[PDB]
Amino acid sequence: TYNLAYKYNFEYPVVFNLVLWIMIGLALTLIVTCYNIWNMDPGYDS
Amino acid sequence: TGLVLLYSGVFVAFWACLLVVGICYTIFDLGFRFDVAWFLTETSPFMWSNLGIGLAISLSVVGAAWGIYITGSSIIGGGVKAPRIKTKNLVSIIFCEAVAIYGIIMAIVISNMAEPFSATDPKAIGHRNYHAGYSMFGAGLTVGLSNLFCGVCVGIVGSGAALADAQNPSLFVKILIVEIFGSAIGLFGVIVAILQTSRVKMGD
Amino acid sequence: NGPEYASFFAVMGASAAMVFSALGAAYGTAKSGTGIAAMSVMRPEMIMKSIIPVVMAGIIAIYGLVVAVLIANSLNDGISLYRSFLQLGAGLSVGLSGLAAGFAIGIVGDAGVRGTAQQPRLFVGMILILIFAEVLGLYGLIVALILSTK
Amino acid sequence: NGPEYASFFAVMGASAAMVFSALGAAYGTAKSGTGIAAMSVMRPEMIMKSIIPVVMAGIIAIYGLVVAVLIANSLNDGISLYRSFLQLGAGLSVGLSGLAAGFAIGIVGDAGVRGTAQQPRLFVGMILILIFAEVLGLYGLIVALILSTK
Amino acid sequence: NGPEYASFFAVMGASAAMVFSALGAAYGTAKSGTGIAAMSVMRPEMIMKSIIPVVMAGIIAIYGLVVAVLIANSLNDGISLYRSFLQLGAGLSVGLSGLAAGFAIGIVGDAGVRGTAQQPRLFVGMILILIFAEVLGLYGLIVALILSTK
Amino acid sequence: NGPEYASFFAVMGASAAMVFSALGAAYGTAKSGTGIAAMSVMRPEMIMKSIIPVVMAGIIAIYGLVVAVLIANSLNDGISLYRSFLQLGAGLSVGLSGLAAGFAIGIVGDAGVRGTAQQPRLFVGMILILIFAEVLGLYGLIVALILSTK
Amino acid sequence: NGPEYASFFAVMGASAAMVFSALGAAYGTAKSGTGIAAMSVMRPEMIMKSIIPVVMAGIIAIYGLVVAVLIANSLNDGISLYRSFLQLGAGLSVGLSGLAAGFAIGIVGDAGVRGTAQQPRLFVGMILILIFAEVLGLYGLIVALILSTK
Amino acid sequence: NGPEYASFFAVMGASAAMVFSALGAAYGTAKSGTGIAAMSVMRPEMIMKSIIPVVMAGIIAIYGLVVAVLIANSLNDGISLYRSFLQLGAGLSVGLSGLAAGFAIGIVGDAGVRGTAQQPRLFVGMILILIFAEVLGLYGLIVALILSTK
Amino acid sequence: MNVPVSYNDSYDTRILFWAQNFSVAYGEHWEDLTSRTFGVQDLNLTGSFWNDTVARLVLTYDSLFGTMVTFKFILANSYYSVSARHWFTLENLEIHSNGSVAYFNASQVTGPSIYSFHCEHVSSENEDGNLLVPDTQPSLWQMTFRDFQIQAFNVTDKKFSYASDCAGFFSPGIWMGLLTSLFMLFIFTYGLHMILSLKTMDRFD
Numbered sequence A: 001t002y003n004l005a006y007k008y009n010f011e012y013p014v015v016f017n018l019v020l021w022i023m024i025g026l027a028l029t030l031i032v033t034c035y036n037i038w039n040m041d042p043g044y045d046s
Numbered sequence B: 001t002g003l004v005l006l007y008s009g010v011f012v013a014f015w016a017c018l019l020v021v022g023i024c025y026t027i028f029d030l031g032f033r034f035d036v037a038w039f040l041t042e043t044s045p046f047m048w049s050n051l052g053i054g055l056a057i058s059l060s061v062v063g064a065a066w067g068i069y070i071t072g073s074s075i076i077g078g079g080v081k082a083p084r085i086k087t088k089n090l091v092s093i094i095f096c097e098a099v100a101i102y103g104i105i106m107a108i109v110i111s112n113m114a115e116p117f118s119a120t121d122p123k124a125i126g127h128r129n130y131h132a133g134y135s136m137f138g139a140g141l142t143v144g145l146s147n148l149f150c151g152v153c154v155g156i157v158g159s160g161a162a163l164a165d166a167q168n169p170s171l172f173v174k175i176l177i178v179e180i181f182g183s184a185i186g187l188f189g190v191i192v193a194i195l196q197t198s199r200v201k202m203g204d
Numbered sequence C, D, E, F, G, H: 001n002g003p004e005y006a007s008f009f010a011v012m013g014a015s016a017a018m019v020f021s022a023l024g025a026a027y028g029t030a031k032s033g034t035g036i037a038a039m040s041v042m043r044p045e046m047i048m049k050s051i052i053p054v055v056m057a058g059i060i061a062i063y064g065l066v067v068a069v070l071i072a073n074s075l076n077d078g079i080s081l082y083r084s085f086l087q088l089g090a091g092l093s094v095g096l097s098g099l100a101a102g103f104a105i106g107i108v109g110d111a112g113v114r115g116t117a118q119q120p121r122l123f124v125g126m127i128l129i130l131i132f133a134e135v136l137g138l139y140g141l142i143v144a145l146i147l148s149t150k
Numbered sequence I: 001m002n003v004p005v006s007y008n009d010s011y012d013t014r015i016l017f018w019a020q021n022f023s024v025a026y027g028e029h030w031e032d033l034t035s036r037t038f039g040v041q042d043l044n045l046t047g048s049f050w051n052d053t054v055a056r057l058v059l060t061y062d063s064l065f066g067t068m069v070t071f072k073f074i075l076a077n078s079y080y081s082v083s084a085r086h087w088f089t090l091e092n093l094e095i096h097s098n099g100s101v102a103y104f105n106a107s108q109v110t111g112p113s114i115y116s117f118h119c120e121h122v123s124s125e126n127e128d129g130n131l132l133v134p135d136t137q138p139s140l141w142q143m144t145f146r147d148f149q150i151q152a153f154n155v156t157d158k159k160f161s162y163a164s165d166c167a168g169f170f171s172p173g174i175w176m177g178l179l180t181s182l183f184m185l186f187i188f189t190y191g192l193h194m195i196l197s198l199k200t201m202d203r204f205d
């Protein structure tokens, strides 16, 4: 009577997207900012 | 291109990972988990319908407003030296105002056929009722995007006819023939929009 | 009969036959009609003879309309899944090839009426290329009729 | 027999064989068609000899039209999954190789007819490169045919 | 026998061996084909001597052709998933290496033909570099062979 | 034995070891190949002297070939999942390192041969820098070999 | 013991430690290699002295090499999931730190040798900045070792 | 104890503490290092006094190194998921804030040493801005510390 | 604790079932029928039918809300033409009180026969997502599963096969809200992209 299944929790649709759309929503803010500051066009002659 | 590099990066990274997620559903056994049946059936026939009613009017007046400022900047631009343009060439504005009329007429047509029901099961909500959801969606796309594309079409030729009229007043009547062929694409969408929803009936 | 979700793909086949062929007909008339109003200032004689590239793009729209009426009338409640994929593959075959015939007419028809205003010998050559550009849409028509009518 | 959604891949073969050949042949007609108008203002003699890039690009469209008809006449309700991937793989094969041949004909057809206006000796070399760009669609045709008869 | 979805990856091996090699051969033909027209205005004698880089890109196309037929003749209904994966990796190994080899041919074929138009001593060195650009597809061919034999 | 999906990752190790190394070998030969043609007009004597970035870019191609043959010879039906994940990691460790090393040879091979037209003393220094760009592919070998013997 | 898919994460650390460090060592060699050729045309005396940024970029490559062998020596089937995650975190922390260090060596190594063509005093200043850019690859090593020992 | 996949987030905290911090220190070394070579052509006397933004940016990698060691010391098998998430937010708050601090020392260290050569009065003000530029990585330390004690 | 199994007279086993908690409620009182099921190791299961297309499980307890009350898990195993497979489905469920029948419906407890369904909450008392719905909404019988695993028609080696969970990366409601939001995020980033480029002039006259 072995081979009992893995116990995924019942709120798996919620928790999966609560991580996913936050993290790729936070990383998209992180790349857009880090880009804008990576090059920022200084006045470097003086 | 700076802002386009975002959309070019999102579109690549989204599909790219669809591909790896696509060759990992088949490769284990998990194609039964995909269920395009469960996607099209479980969700709602109100979501497809009320999006198509919303996309009918809104995407048509997107191209209607798009067609105005292409030639409306050409009216005031060429009209500074030649002010005789302004009354003769407003028919190009109306030819991208008819495409919003075709939108709002089809919008109140498609909105009248929506009717609430009580069933919640994909078998209780019959195939007469799910087809009612998809047909209002596809009618909204074929009258929304078609009036959008012909809205840009009569606006672009309307801008060129506004600039040839500044040079020579006898030209605008001949170039007006081209905008008739451009505005015929709008009527072609409304024909298919009322044929996709002629036989349909929503409700229970 | 067929399942409940079966009618979805036939509606998309009726839509994409008309949506994408509208985009072809829009570009084929806007990009070429830009060239008509441009050349008309220096040579108003061909202002009625060069309206034929914008009507070759007009037939691209009526290629998409015929298969739209075919699919929207053969559509019914409870069609099989086999019939709906045929009508979905019909509309993608005509609209997205009419999109190609719409781009090919617009780029050639814009360039053709510029060269015709500079030299009128090109007009016998311009309508020959517009024949080859339009039959791209005509091949998409006959594959849509051989797919939807099975 | 097989599953009901098996016919989805087969009509995706009949669709993508047509449009990707058509999108290639559109690029062959449009990009070379601008080359016709730019050269004909100075050299009006080479307009009927110089239309050969838009005709050789038209053979790409009939390469796709053959496979799209051959797949559509081989369609049946309840075809097996193995039969359906053959017509799907044949559709992408003649299409995307015809799409690539459609780009190559349009590029060397554009730059070729600009060169023949500047020197008529290039007209013998231009058809030589245009043949080599055209056989890429022919290589896709013979492997699409070897997949459809199976 | 194997699973039902197995033969999808094998015909994807047949398609990707063709369409990626044809995309490579199209780039080698087109990027070098503009170099022939730019050379021909001043030095028309080295026209037939300059068909070689579009010929060397043509061998890249038939490199993907022989393995596409080799996969398509080894196809069968219900092949094992181990066998079908072998042909999928055989297809990507010759096409994407042929796409890189076709990219390498077209770049040095463009500059080398333009470079030899000013000096004929480069022509012996240019065809030597094109040898190294071709064998990249030949290395991808022989691993596509030993993956298709198993 | 192992699972049915096991052979997929090892085969993708065999294909990525070739096409990524060939992509490096393409960019090593193409970016240095345009450097030879722009140099050779002024100094035609240093032709055979200047093929050595193109030949060392070809060593990156046979770098991927050795690992691809070694992976394809260990392939068997029903291997363990641990064995296939090694050959997948062995494929990326030589291909994406050869793509990096092939990118390194191309850039300094372009800049190096353009400078040797103006000064011959750079040639004994340019070959020293190409050696350091060559060991990056050689470092990709000894990790790919030590991942395949296990 | 651990699951069957546990070995996938550890071999990813074995590859990414070598792949990303090779990209850093390439950019340290390629971007600084253009600076040597632009400097060499005026100052042929500082050529054997100017190779000091491309040697330090080679030290970035052996930082990824020693951990790739050390992870591959620790590879075994039936390893725990805890042991595999450490070697994945060790491999990323030395390759992507070596890619960062190879970025810094490539930038200041290029601008340093362009500057020292106009002043020999910069050579002791440039080698000071290259040391500080070198320890970035070294700091990625000591976290890779402290993760792989446990 | 915790789940089997718990250790992945903590070792991600050990790697992101080093990867983003070394990348921040790389930009502070590279951008200010280009400023040194442009400065020293006109003013060679201040290069010992001018390599201070290269040194202040180097502590960013050392700030990331401390948290990378502190997280790797608390690592054991069967850590709780609460303890694993704390080390993940410890590494992200000291790595990415160090990447923010390395951006500030990179820009101000670049433009500040340009004005230091043309005027020595800026040296009191330049190092004063670099104080506020470095504390961004220092503020990321004490939040990485206070997350790691729990 | 082990599973209640139903082995056949032929040398192969048949349908088996497992839970953690098993509670049945009548009116207001909750009765934990989980020690009598899995730990007790002895059960009165009258008719364990099997025909290779239709199978049942009767579980009876003899010590419950008043009287002897039985629970009936009803499975089926059909061949679906669109999917070309065999999909098992818990058809409904039955509780039998004084004569009366409870009739709990269980859709979304389906599976593809080779594998086994497994869910976390198969409870009654409908809120949004509960798989068990009664035929009458003011029903008295309610039941609660804090774990769940049933395999039927394809059991091998007297143990469960792989799981076909109720886990659901997108269940329909999030998958409607995502398709609404990510559609009008295409509108918002379009309206923002036009606003981000309306740059001012350099000089005046």
Ligand SMILES: CCCCCCCC/C=C\CCCCCCCC(=O)O
Residues within 6 Å of the ligand: A021, A022, A025, A026, A029, A032, A033, A036
């Ligand atoms: C949970 C939600 C997570 C996502 C939050 C989304 C909000 C992000 C807001 C935008 C930040 C963009 C900053 C870019 C600055 C632009 C530079 C400039 O304008 O000069």
Ligand SMILES: *[C@@H]1O[C@H](CO)[C@@H](O)[C@H](O)[C@H]1NC(C)=O
Residues within 6 Å of the ligand: I020, I021, I022, I023, I030, I031, I032, I034, I144, I146
């Ligand atoms: C469910 O059963 C557990 C024993 O496994 C018990 O502790 C718990 O109280 C029960 N819950 C209900 C609601 O009866």
Ligand SMILES: *[C@@H]1O[C@H](CO)[C@@H](O)[C@H](O)[C@H]1NC(C)=O
Residues within 6 Å of the ligand: I044, I045, I046, I060, I070
């Ligand atoms: C088992 O339950 C049934 C209920 O229908 C009953 O008739 C039978 O007597 C019971 N058997 C035993 C041994 O209790």
Ligand SMILES: *[C@@H]1O[C@H](CO)[C@@H](O)[C@H](O)[C@H]1NC(C)=O
Residues within 6 Å of the ligand: I051, I054
């Ligand atoms: C198997 O039993 C079911 C139970 O009602 C019955 O309907 C079916 O006809 C039986 N099949 C055979 C082959 O006896």
Ligand SMILES: *[C@@H]1O[C@H](CO)[C@@H](O)[C@H](O)[C@H]1NC(C)=O
Residues within 6 Å of the ligand: I026, I065, I066, I067, I069, I097, I098
């Ligand atoms: C069944 O009937 C007996 C006697 O009337 C009563 O005590 C018991 O509660 C009833 N059972 C249920 C579940 O109502």
Ligand SMILES: *[C@@H]1O[C@H](CO)[C@@H](O)[C@H](O)[C@H]1NC(C)=O
Residues within 6 Å of the ligand: B121, I092, I103, I104, I105, I106, I107, I135
């Ligand atoms: C609920 O179960 C009853 C039992 O006979 C059945 O008749 C009905 O069709 C089911 N309804 C749903 C929506 O499952």
